[PDB]
Amino acid sequence: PQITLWKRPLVTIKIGGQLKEALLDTGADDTVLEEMNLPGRWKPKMIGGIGGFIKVRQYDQILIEICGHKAIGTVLVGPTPVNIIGRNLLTQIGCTLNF
Amino acid sequence: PQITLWKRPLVTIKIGGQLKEALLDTGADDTVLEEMNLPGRWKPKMIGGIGGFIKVRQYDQILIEICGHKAIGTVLVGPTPVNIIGRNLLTQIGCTLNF
Ligand SMILES: CCC(CC)CN(C[C@@H](O)[C@H](Cc1ccccc1)NC(=O)O[C@H]1CO[C@H]2OCC[C@H]21)S(=O)(=O)c1ccc(N)cc1
Numbered sequence A, B: 001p002q003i004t005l006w007k008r009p010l011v012t013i014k015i016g017g018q019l020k021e022a023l024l025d026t027g028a029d030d031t032v033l034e035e036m037n038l039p040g041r042w043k044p045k046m047i048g049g050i051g052g053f054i055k056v057r058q059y060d061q062i063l064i065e066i067c068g069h070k071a072i073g074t075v076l077v078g079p080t081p082v083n084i085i086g087r088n089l090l091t092q093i094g095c096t097l098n099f
Helices: B087-093
Strands: A010-015 A018-024 A043-049 A052-066 A069-077 A096-098 B002-004 B010-015 B018-024 B031-033 B043-049 B052-066 B069-077 B096-098
Touching: B018 B031, B052 B087, B069 B087
Parallel strands: B031 B069
Antiparallel strands: A010 A018, A010 A052, A043 A052, A052 A069, A096 B002, A096 B096, B010 B018, B010 B052, B043 B052, B052 B069
């Protein structure tokens, strides 16, 4: 679908068998979700935003469905202000910017 | 044009007679640019993201040209690591997400 930007581009995602709201964020290299219990192994990593760096748990090769589109990639879990879908997954669902 | 997301969506912009590179950021509510000396009045503001908040200067009715598309609106200026074009100006250039 085509999404205009008058409102935040929020969509429903399905990760680990749970539905969640997430922001499509072309300014994010990586996907970062709020604190949650995910199955599988994870490694501690650091990521930096506009206001500094935070500690996150890195889950690799996680299945995540975004508006009925399947992706399998890296998902970071930590104290992000909001669930964001970054380019690592936006590329997988075929997302482009157009103007 | 159509911008894929394999790499950061960086484009050339023109503001206050200066050319800069900036990120087309659907996750940013408002445009925030690196520290620069813009004339005119401004209002202090704080904006939040990963890592916390930064203090910025809010300028209103600022003209920016993005890839030849003109747009006028709020421009925040502060210690951001990257120039960010946010939804407030992305809507004005007819920019959409598509997948
Ligand atoms: C509240 C929703 C997001 C943060 C979650 C808002 N951000 C825009 C976002 O695109 C930001 C924009 C951004 C890009 C690059 C450096 C700092 C900020 N990218 C970002 O934080 O991405 C992180 C996750 O992927 C990684 O790649 C980029 C950093 C990591 S922001 O920078 O903090 C921001 C907040 C308010 C305004 N008005 C303008 C920008």
